[PDB]
Design an enzyme around this catalytic site. Structure first.
Site, PDB file in Angstrom:
ATOM      1  N   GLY A  20       2.298   5.922   9.633  1.00  0.00           N
ATOM      2  CA  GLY A  20       3.733   5.824   9.301  1.00  0.00           C
ATOM      3  C   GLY A  20       4.520   4.677   9.680  1.00  0.00           C
ATOM      4  O   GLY A  20       5.540   4.552   9.528  1.00  0.00           O
ATOM      5  N   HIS A  66       0.760  -1.092   0.060  1.00  0.00           N
ATOM      6  CA  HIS A  66      -0.039   0.063  -0.022  1.00  0.00           C
ATOM      7  C   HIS A  66       0.901   1.347  -0.030  1.00  0.00           C
ATOM      8  O   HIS A  66       0.172   2.430  -0.133  1.00  0.00           O
ATOM      9  CB  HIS A  66      -1.153   0.110   0.987  1.00  0.00           C
ATOM     10  CG  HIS A  66      -0.788   0.199   2.459  1.00  0.00           C
ATOM     11  ND1 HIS A  66      -0.622  -0.808   3.461  1.00  0.00           N
ATOM     12  CD2 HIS A  66      -0.261   1.442   3.155  1.00  0.00           C
ATOM     13  CE1 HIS A  66      -0.089  -0.394   4.341  1.00  0.00           C
ATOM     14  NE2 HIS A  66      -0.023   1.070   4.515  1.00  0.00           N
ATOM     15  N   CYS A 106       3.382   1.711   9.310  1.00  0.00           N
ATOM     16  CA  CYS A 106       3.370   0.526   8.293  1.00  0.00           C
ATOM     17  C   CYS A 106       4.844  -0.089   7.887  1.00  0.00           C
ATOM     18  O   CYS A 106       5.668   0.835   7.609  1.00  0.00           O
ATOM     19  CB  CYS A 106       2.481   0.475   7.279  1.00  0.00           C
ATOM     20  SG  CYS A 106       0.725   0.766   7.792  1.00  0.00           S
TER      21      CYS A 106
HETATM   22  C1  LIG Z   1      -3.231   4.547   9.224  1.00  0.00           C
HETATM   23  C2  LIG Z   1      -2.734   3.383  10.280  1.00  0.00           C
HETATM   24  C3  LIG Z   1      -2.298   3.556  11.418  1.00  0.00           C
HETATM   25  C4  LIG Z   1      -1.745   2.684  11.962  1.00  0.00           C
HETATM   26  N1  LIG Z   1      -1.666   1.423  11.647  1.00  0.00           N
HETATM   27  C5  LIG Z   1      -1.757   1.149  10.233  1.00  0.00           C
HETATM   28  C6  LIG Z   1      -2.358   1.937   9.421  1.00  0.00           C
HETATM   29  N2  LIG Z   1      -2.717   2.258   8.186  1.00  0.00           N
HETATM   30  C7  LIG Z   1      -3.891   1.499   7.543  1.00  0.00           C
HETATM   31  O1  LIG Z   1      -4.650   1.030   8.310  1.00  0.00           O
HETATM   32  C8  LIG Z   1      -3.888   1.314   6.282  1.00  0.00           C
HETATM   33  C9  LIG Z   1      -4.566   0.031   5.604  1.00  0.00           C
HETATM   34  C10 LIG Z   1      -3.905  -0.520   4.637  1.00  0.00           C
HETATM   35  C11 LIG Z   1      -4.177  -0.056   3.290  1.00  0.00           C
HETATM   36  C12 LIG Z   1      -5.259   1.031   3.034  1.00  0.00           C
HETATM   37  C13 LIG Z   1      -5.253   2.247   4.084  1.00  0.00           C
HETATM   38  C14 LIG Z   1      -5.250   1.526   5.478  1.00  0.00           C
END
Ligand SMILES: Cc1ccncc1NC(=O)[C@H]1[C@@H]2CCCC[C@@H]21
Ligand SMILES: Cc1ccncc1NC(=O)[C@H]1[C@@H]2CCCC[C@@H]21
EC number: 3.4.19.12
Lengths: 304, 304
Positions: A143, A41, A145
């Site tokens: 951030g 992503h 991820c």
């Molecule tokens: C913003 C965040 C905060 C903490 N841990 C993780 C995240 N990110 C997500 O949850 C991304 C998931 C997969 C692709 C599409 C957008 C959301």
């Protein structure tokens, strides 16, 4: 003596963290040998995230669009490929700090350390369990991820988790290092059911053994139980059913303390039925399930 | 979101750990620049430990009696001196992995990470608080002496603790890196009174703010209190008296959440007087005091 929720030393993993930027998105990557692994992503923008067509989004990207920075040195990307939910960016330089490593898919109920990172820089390390429903209850902000979970066996780092998502409930989901999600989750910004979770019975028993080893023993009683009887109580209280394989893994702790596994099950049954009555076990006022029997043995013997 | 008891990444400290052997005793040393720091009790034998005459025991030792091994490379000891309860072994090689560092003496109620080690090898990392009575509740077995506690501010490691002792109660005592014990403790195998301990009020309040930030808010109420009234409750429940300096340090969390410090004190007063009623806050069934207000701000903002 003393028993703490200990994480593995994170140094070997710190040496592998990099920052990956694609377009407007920055997250973390794991640089092992000449490959950088990161969540796919990183190629999405705000409008894509409800249901991204990853194959089409990736087709718009070239090697030069993936900006990989290891501390302050830039890595040259010479290939890119998507495997399940991860991207593998081939770089022209092998990480000189690559430890001996393996990619493993852990089982629900197993524990691991997470090195939380932002912009390729480590923020902190903590130990957690993969819930029976394949979520983790971590500490992740936007951030983070690409931050990874791992275990260490002597000099070998077994990477088991890469962070991808925060569900609307505030719990976390991610993949193994081949990009396969743990659980039913998909990498989209949608509400997604996490299954009914349960408490990891074998870990609670392991922790009661760690408590007796360290002197907290008020919960030991004059009773015993059977696997059948215990499992009726486990059922009522949403605990995983205990099997002979779990009893077998508790063998070393039963041998060390001299407390038969079913006698510890009878202590756990009484704690489930009566509560703690305002008391604590190893500084906790609830039944702790984030220590496996292996974790207890390692901590109680000072393994390095 | 999510809030975990996070330790600092331990890599910079892992690079400083060495094994020090003197006679029959082996423990850990900290190699910074061309000096290795370790507990002075590495020079004791079983018969010495009730009341060692450290000055006399050290006079029997020469530089060549201190065996210092960094992983698998042997260090050449060219000087030795005792400073308070630590030995400083001058070596002929500066540690190439020496990070930017400081030696600091922390205050009671402050938190730090411990890198538990055995034979100069890291076993695990965990976060803890220095109790108001100057003990720590760690996880230390025989051989862990010389393991250190630290904090990290960007690239700088502030070493604040070196482990020396397990009191007969199972709690831990140690020194700053100049070898001065925290608390009234002496490095002898004797029963030693640790003072009356208290709960670190400002940390519990910081953690209630972390809980509101992360969605656990059931404990918020319609009440307020005063410092005077709150301190009568703190007195009854063995909590540290809250001061305006503590209220001031909670300022950023009060500003972020919009919950005045005295209103959070009224929630804490109600929790002290009524208990949790079988509920949890951030996965805990008790009031957590091992997060400072700085820890909460750092974790809630993703500082690296
Ligand atoms: C913003 C965040 C905060 C903490 N841990 C993780 C995240 N990110 C997500 O949850 C991304 C998931 C997969 C692709 C599409 C957008 C959301
Ligand atoms: C054995 C152990 C276990 C855990 N932590 C620490 C220790 N070590 C001690 O308590 C040593 C204290 C100072 C010098 C005299 C002997 C005893």
């Amino acid at each position: 003596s003393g028993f703490r929720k200990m994480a593995f030393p994170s140094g070997k993993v710190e040496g592998c963290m990099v920052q990956v930027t694609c377009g407007t998105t920055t997250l973390n990557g794991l640089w092992l040998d000449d490959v950088v692994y990161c969540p796919r992503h990183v190629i999405c923008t705000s409008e894509d995230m409800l249901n991204p067509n990853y194959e089409d989004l990736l087709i718009r990207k070239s090697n030069h669009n993936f900006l990989v920075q290891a501390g302050n040195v830039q890595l040259r990307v010479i290939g890119h490929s998507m495997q399940n939910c991860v991207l593998k960016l081939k770089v022209d330089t092998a990480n000189p700090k690559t430890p001996k490593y393996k990619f493993v898919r852990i089982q629900p109920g197993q524990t691991f350390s997470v090195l939380a990172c932002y912009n390729g820089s480590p923020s902190g390390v903590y130990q957690c369990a993969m819930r029976p429903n394949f979520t983790i209850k971590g500490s992740f902000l936007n951030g983070s991820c690409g931050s990874v979970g791992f275990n260490i066996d002597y000099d070998c780092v077994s990477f088991c988790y890469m962070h991808h998502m925060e569900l609307p409930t505030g719990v976390h989901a991610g993949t193994d290092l081949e990009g396969n999600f743990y659980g039913p989750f998909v990498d989209r910004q949608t509400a997604q059911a996490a299954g009914t979770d349960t408490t990891i019975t074998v870990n609670v028993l392991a922790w009661l053994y760690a408590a007796v080893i360290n002197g907290d023993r008020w919960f030991l009683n004059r009773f015993t139980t059977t696997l059948n009887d215990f499992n009726l109580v486990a059922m009522k209280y949403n605990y995983e059913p205990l099997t002979q394989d779990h009893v077998d893994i508790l063998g070393p702790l039963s041998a060390q303390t001299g407390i038969a596994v079913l006698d510890m099950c009878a202590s756990l049954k009484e704690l489930l039925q009566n509560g703690m009555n305002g008391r604590t076990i190893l500084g906790s006022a609830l039944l702790e399930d984030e220590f496996t029997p292996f974790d207890v043995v390692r901590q109680c013997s000072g393994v390095t």
